[PDB]
Amino acid sequence: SESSIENFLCRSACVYMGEYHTTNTDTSKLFASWTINARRMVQMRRKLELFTYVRFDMEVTFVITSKQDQGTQLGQDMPPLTHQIMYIPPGGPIPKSVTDYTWQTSTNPSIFWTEGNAPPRMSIPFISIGNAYSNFYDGWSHGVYGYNTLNHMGQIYVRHVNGSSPLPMTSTVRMYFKPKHVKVWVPRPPRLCQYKNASTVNFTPTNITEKRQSINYIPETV
Amino acid sequence: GLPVMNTPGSNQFLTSDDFQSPSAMPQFDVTPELNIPGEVQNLMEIAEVDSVVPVNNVEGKLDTMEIYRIPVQSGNHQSSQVFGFQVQPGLDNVFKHTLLGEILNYYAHWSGSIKLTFVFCGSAMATGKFLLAYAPPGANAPKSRKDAMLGTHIIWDVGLQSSCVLCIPWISQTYTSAGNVTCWYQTGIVVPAGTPTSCSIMCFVSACNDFSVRLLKDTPFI
Amino acid sequence: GLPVMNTPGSNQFLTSDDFQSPSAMPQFDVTPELNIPGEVQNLMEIAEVDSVVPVNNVEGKLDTMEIYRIPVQSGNHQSSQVFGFQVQPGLDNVFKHTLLGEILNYYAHWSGSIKLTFVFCGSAMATGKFLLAYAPPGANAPKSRKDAMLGTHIIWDVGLQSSCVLCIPWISQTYTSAGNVTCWYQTGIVVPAGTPTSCSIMCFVSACNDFSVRLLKDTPFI
Amino acid sequence: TFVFCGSAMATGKFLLAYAPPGANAPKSRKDAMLGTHIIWDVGLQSSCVLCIPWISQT
């Protein structure tokens, strides 16, 4: 009953930790970004490789902290900061800067939040025109091996909701991920190799198990 | 209206909570389910499958197929030992990476009973006898064929049976304090003319119907 | 009184929430509704209307009415091709800005079936024949009139019918991997004396009854 | 009807393939496998029977 599929997988984990600033000279360090694939968190990856097709809902909680730079200016009296967290479905537009029009589009679901309150949280349905996600794919996209276009699940963008010419602060986000209502099909043998990259199944040859003294060896009874 | 009183535990994010969550895409109808063959409800369905044991895990043969073959030699050697090991899945290197072994390393406490199966892979003209002996946990390994005969044993005649199955009741975890299994030459192998010389034994391990696991943890393999 | 316990998620502003709200003008009676004609319940009611396709979208004629007219020429040319295009709404520039095309660009996944309609706008004395051929997705475009006749086709005689309707079943999105439609001169146009020389074909696209859309997003047009 | 007259200790496999009238003879084992065939294991059967429907002359 503790070996049920739901108790084995319905558990939370930190999957991404990014940093983003209020003012900078880089314009890519002004927002935080993460493509959502289930092959780049090594926590849940090996537990999912026991199965061939999976189907679940997704629940995401956010933990956000800030600090003021140690550059020059003290004596401030700042109000609490506001943060925007935008989810893009598979097939939506992608921003390029924090001042883009794409932060304001009516079809990207977004969350606004101010510090001191409870941490924010939203839930995602099973978003696939297919009938299950695919942990394994033996074939081509149309041409990249192993990758198909049915495992698109979206992206996450975070920025500050300041006005104009803000004060210099730097923020950090932790994204916590959790699957719900999980169903699996076609079990597979476990991975007896260390993972090399986050896209393929490539590996180096490793031994089957560890050695002992002889085929008759049994350690002494205490 | 409706006087209300906040209890402690408010506005915390607990990683193991089970609350409702706001959905980010309410105007979305999910794809209906498809009846894919091979649905899994429980991890005991994976542990209750036979898998091949790497018994010959000695120095030199850890990356060849020779690790799976027990080397039966020819001639008259009718008191020597063929093999021996302790029955300790999850800990011992013999049983560590099987299908039952990999599942047991996600849990901290487990207990059940094990089914072993031995298969003689020789030519159809070979005949002979073996003795398969089991000592309970606490007892020492036998040192001769005679005192193995005075315990719990079974005499296996490979000219009449190609396989012999063995159920072991009392299995758990915490210099062994575990049971063990050994095999002894009763007779020796007799062949006619124009046959291969050597012969081999293979071994399969699985779990019986009652098997319990508790306290999901991290796996110590990656 | 009434012991109460705050759960995490308290005092956050989630952009997708659906809570009650305090009204700012409670002593206000709204104007009653008026039965205006033309009420819309669903965006599929807009997509299921015919609209004119700009098939002749070549260089030079993109801001004239000449973009909507297919140029049927006179003489004897009874094997040449009249037009051809892929059936890919939302992506292809032919179908991109129609009434069905503009609705499909608010959604990230869609699938259904399409109705095409062709109208011959010549004089009442012109007669001739055309061949309208459909290739499924995956198949190549035909290169002659003969191999278009060996597929799924229809022979359209504009002296007897002014219009011909065509339903296309398997439509979705993700160098095409889509179906296509082509038109071929079977005979050529025959006129009497004292008639205009050239003639034109127009094309209308709409959506059939079953059409599904998912994952509302931002539109990539402004 | 085909009968294998070997010793009792011999084992192996054969492929018996039939092409209809009009079709060419196969040139490999692979394209004979892509037609109508049967895999005959002489360690388990000593004989294999075969019925052929469309027979005539000119």
Added chain:
Amino acid sequence: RVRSITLGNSTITTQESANVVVAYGRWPEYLKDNEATAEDQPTQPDVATCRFYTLESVTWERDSPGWWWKFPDALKDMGLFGQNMYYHYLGRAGYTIHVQCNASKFHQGCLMVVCVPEAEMGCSQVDGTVNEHSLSEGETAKKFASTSTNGTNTVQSIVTNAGMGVGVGNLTIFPHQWINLRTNNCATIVMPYINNVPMDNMFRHHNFTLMIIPFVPLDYSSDSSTYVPITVTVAPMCAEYNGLR
């Protein structure tokens, strides 16, 4: 004690005491009526799909790591089944695989016969992309290796990892049979259609892979035959395609 089976204009003979594995308990069938009811039109040829297609034989010797075949792309030149792979854009099918071998009673050996669904294989070098020609040769079996491979574009086909980074003793989780030469020399596996969509293209996607691996190597003595041939015969079952009208 011989049963003879006919499909179309094909006839093979088996032993009627053979033991059959159905893959996950599921026979093949057609997709019923109304999962895509409106305009998605299916059809089935049924005529020259249900007949036995016999591949060639492979030679088993003392040093043979194994053989594998991709399904489909191994039936792409097999007559009418390879024809509908060209004309139709979508399709699905199930299969019945017979594997047979001919040996004496003076030989010994042991085979594993397994059908691995979506056997996604890794490249020989770590930072590389696998080529499609190193995955399949069509009707010709590829070969595993008894040592670790190198070079570029090669599949890391050491037999102990099975090209998948898993332990080869654990492929009993898949539908499998054992062939032990001092017992039976036949194996039959029925394989339904398994995918995450109802139909799909047949040149871009490999559904499953048939693998044959010797655990106990073949050995013989003085004047016996130094080889054993293995024969694979495939019958497509309940195949179905998109409509063209």
